[PDB]
Symmetry: D3
Subunit: 215 residues, 6 copies
């Protein structure tokens, strides 16, 4: 079946990871190709202001077993905000994918595992850059050096996710969050995200020059 289902509802698109023979792994070339295409199509449709990314079934993404860097690079050029609605296990590359999204919310049955170290590996997809910016450096160290699972309540406590919902309330909550963004003029939403992206790395002077030019 199609590894990434794309549903549109107004100014919001929902992307559903659907790799049922591999627990929603994102390392297959079909999925990577579909993810590239989804980003480019969302960028090109200026009516779209929010993407909700979630997984079909019990898993968000078991991750799977540079090519593994195409999905992270696709997200970096995505102009619209991306909300990860983490419905279940987010493991390995699947954990890093959720952490690379702009906002995370989770079902109570979700959990995260920066599992690479347990396999003799490091996060080859850039997860070590994004994780300390979601939970702080000490918690990112705990997650990366033990590889252990973090359940939904702990994730909320650490700021890894913004809210925790019952399994039935997760997607309704993601759409409510998406609509609080989508009510605003689409070009401004995209300009705001571009400015926020700049602020992660650039100096204050660079941000001031960009903000003055964009306004």
């Amino acid at each position: 079946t199609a590894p990434l289902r794309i549903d549109r509802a107004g100014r919001v698109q929902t992307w559903t990871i659907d790799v049922p023979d591999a627990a929603n792994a994102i390392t297959g070339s079909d999925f990577i190709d579909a993810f590239d295409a989804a980003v480019d199509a969302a960028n090109a449709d200026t009516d779209i202001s929010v993407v909700i990314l979630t997984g079909a079934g019990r898993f968000f993404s078991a991750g799977g077993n540079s090519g593994i860097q195409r999905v992270p690079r696709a997200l970096q050029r995505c102009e619209v905000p991306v909300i990860a609605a983490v419905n279940g296990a987010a493991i390995g590359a699947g954990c890093d994918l959720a952490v690379m999204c702009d906002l995370r919310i989770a079902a109570e049955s979700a959990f995260f595992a920066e599992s690479f170290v347990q396999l003799g590996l490091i996060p080859g997809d850039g997860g070590t850059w994004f994780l300390p910016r979601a939970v702080g450096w000490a918690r990112a160290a705990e997650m990366t050096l033990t590889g252990d699972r973090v359940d939904a309540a702990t994730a909320l406590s650490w700021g890894l996710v913004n809210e925790v919902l019952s399994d039935d309330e997760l997607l309704p909550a993601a759409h409510r969050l998406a609509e609080r963004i989508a009510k605003n003029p689409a070009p401004a939403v995209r300009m705001a995200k571009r400015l926020l992206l700049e602020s992660r790395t650039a100096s204050l002077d660079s941000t001031l020059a960009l903000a003055a030019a964009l306004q």
Copy 2:
């Protein structure tokens, strides 16, 4: 009336935004001129070790409708710590002003709104650089992309403010906080702030070289 009232109490100055015909907006040239002057006068009076910034009446600052960058640049050259005592609505430029201060405390009736996106605008004053450093990137994205209001308890929960007080206890609490700083030798307070400012952007090696030179 004078748009920025300056009261002195020992080693602490209190600055009160007072633009009553515009809900304490800070975009007027009179206020901007007075803010410039206040910073320079505080820098020059080496007895001053803390500034408390607050708003007269019900508002901290409704913000108002590069020139909008003079106030942020004035705060960057202010050598003394600035405590924002947010007594009410802090909207738009007023939100960013509070976020640019070193420390925030709030009355229970305060709220914050990074409202620009709702107007088809981005924060033209550098708010996108400071906000992720107060609340983390995911919460800054939520605030900037929805533009929605954040009440005092939520702000405390997110780390946007350090304490929440009753409306009557706000300024007494700000002075207690200011005095915990002002009890210390004034030159060291200023050197410490200069070092902390360096650490926001510079490498560890740059901070080590500066600390070794200052000591």
Copy 3:
């Protein structure tokens, strides 16, 4: 007596600060020499995957009264994760040492004080670079500009430490945490820490290039 006791238990070493005539101060040349040696010996013994750093007696380190930068530089070249098990007062240089470790846990009788400002000084050892990355900039400003003590519960609330234990449960908890790391292949633990260190400062592109090369 020996200022830094080194105990080995499997893949975990415990380092105990033991300067009983100076409340575990770390500014003495004997301690600094022993700390240098401990780091180099731990780096060279590839079986070691975790260091637990703690203090003998009632103090973690009262700190004491560039040379004060040798201990911070030793920690920067330490390849293995370091867990600070803060058993008591961590003051001045002792506070900064704990903050420079990768992870902190604390006994209920522990407290932290970025005390330099009260002495007319700034943190000459790089504490201003590490502290905002443990507690955020506003809390680091509060700690550095007042110099006041932060007790264990407040430290937990601010994210300065990851857990707070009874005085009797502190070291058992540190070993449980260390073992969650040490169960993993030692070379991967060290590669993961090296990647996490890179992510503190480098761009996303630099982290992606390093991760691709290490994998």
Copy 4:
């Protein structure tokens, strides 16, 4: 009209010839940009390739033309093989910036460069202001960008904008000699070295040391 980027292979060296004859080899058209994307991706994928020579068909290197114009800089940023600009004629506007984004430049005696944007009320929208100071130093980049005036081949040589100036007939032979001095070396090491050189433009010393240590296998 024609394939906008002709791709020739000679051993481990590919030549890319800009060929937009109805617009003086402008690179701002979407057909060219798409072909440049594809050529970079194909060269990265073919581990037999070690060097690209980039040049223009006919009298022009690239007259430049009239975010989309930023796809070309980003493509060169992800290009793993060294790129030699063999500037055979006018390199104007976007064409000037393209040559400056390449790793090495050599020029024909009839070549010239112009950061012409300012003369039309424009700025270099493609990142030329980032690359030009790293080719000629900040003062000469300011002179070129703020006046927009043309810089001939001899002046370009004097400023270090190009490494050598050849007669029109000797340009491509010289580009191939230079390419062969690279292509003689083991192909994986050439690509790793370029990746290291790219990292050094911005990263700290510590970052370069970490990458070099990681790459040596």
Copy 5:
């Protein structure tokens, strides 16, 4: 004694002449610093102005003199118009650093430069160590800063510290010719280009691409 910074306008070009005759055009006095602040702010505000020529009255460009000395570098950092240093004579200490902080330098045959601080037991307190390597490269900046010795006009030309050396009578005519090659261009584009060039000294490529895309309107 006199107005420390004389301001002349000729079309879109302003000339600022340092005039501190009782201290050999030193720029460390609070009167001069205040005037330099005001001149930058006035030039930014007058959108008709496109170029500043900075030069010294009499025999000296600036003997330098004896945070306050850091207001001048910060003023040039916020100056939106290009600044040409027309170095007519000795540029010593703070005066050397001022010339190096300008966008372009040209010099009279009697000019010379000296990063003299080290000879008096001092370091360049005004940021000269940041700007000098970007003018002459790190090795020559080390030579100038660690010896403190004087660099004459011909050596300065050879090192790229200045772009041209003119006879004493031809310096200001040459500075105006260079200024006019800038000032002929649309005034808003000249200022946007300088803002882009300033961003490129430090920012990543991605930051420059984002700003260039935002500025083109």
Copy 6:
């Protein structure tokens, strides 16, 4: 075989002579690395020392040899005194990078440089790719690193890799003249200036201004 790094003192100038005769002055052996660490630490500790001249015994500067190789770059990074490389002969591989890591280079007419790693399927594992572009610019560094070919003394001079080329007999006399132009200045100011110059390679302008203000006492 012998002390791998001979240390001579003449007033405030120390000369370090690489002396590994059974391996053509290679610097990759653990004995040499240990001695280089010790020499840097001893020179930092002796406040009477103001300049180091680094050179090779015999015909070679350093043939380089076959993380451990990264201790030498890190040692030079913490060396507080200026280091002049007096390149008396072949500087190959790690030896090329060592010369480039020094503050100033001068060379004998028989010297040459080779970033030879790529020819053996290797990359510069010691940080040479970070330092080389800052000595010769990014295009020449790419040429040297991607071809690996030898650069003779005259070409090195032309590219700014070295500041002067001397006859074999005049090299060390010239190195001492250059060292004395530094060593004549107050020793604490020389070290503070180098610390400021090191900061400027990477830090923002604001960081340099803050450090300069803090260091002037």
